[PDB]
Amino acid sequence: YDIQAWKKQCEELLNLIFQCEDSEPFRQPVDLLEYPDYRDIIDTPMDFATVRETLEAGNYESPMELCKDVRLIFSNSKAYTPSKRSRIYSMSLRLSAFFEEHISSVLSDYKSALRFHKR
């Protein structure tokens, strides 16, 4: 029933993601010098350092907001990929499955804690 517990849970999940080799293309913003057309395709860049910094700044109110930004990292990779078999996109799919597997309980616990608070 702890309404604040999601924050440390998200910090720990981000630490695991940064240890994962599959996160390396997503740890910092996409390099616009190496992918010069990136902003012609992607409206809202997102990366894991931006997510971590937003969390540490106290600029997420809920784990749902964090989850929306993490999902944007994956949807950007899918939208920019030239192929569904591309290396970076394939890494995003594995990392997304890992993220979804771990965020599920964080979201469930937060929503149940909030329902208890408003009972």
Ligand SMILES: CCn1cc(NC(=O)C2CCC2)cn1
């Ligand atoms: C396929 C386009 N794309 C590029 C990346 N990553 C980078 O450019 C690295 C420079 C630091 C992050 C991820 N996706």
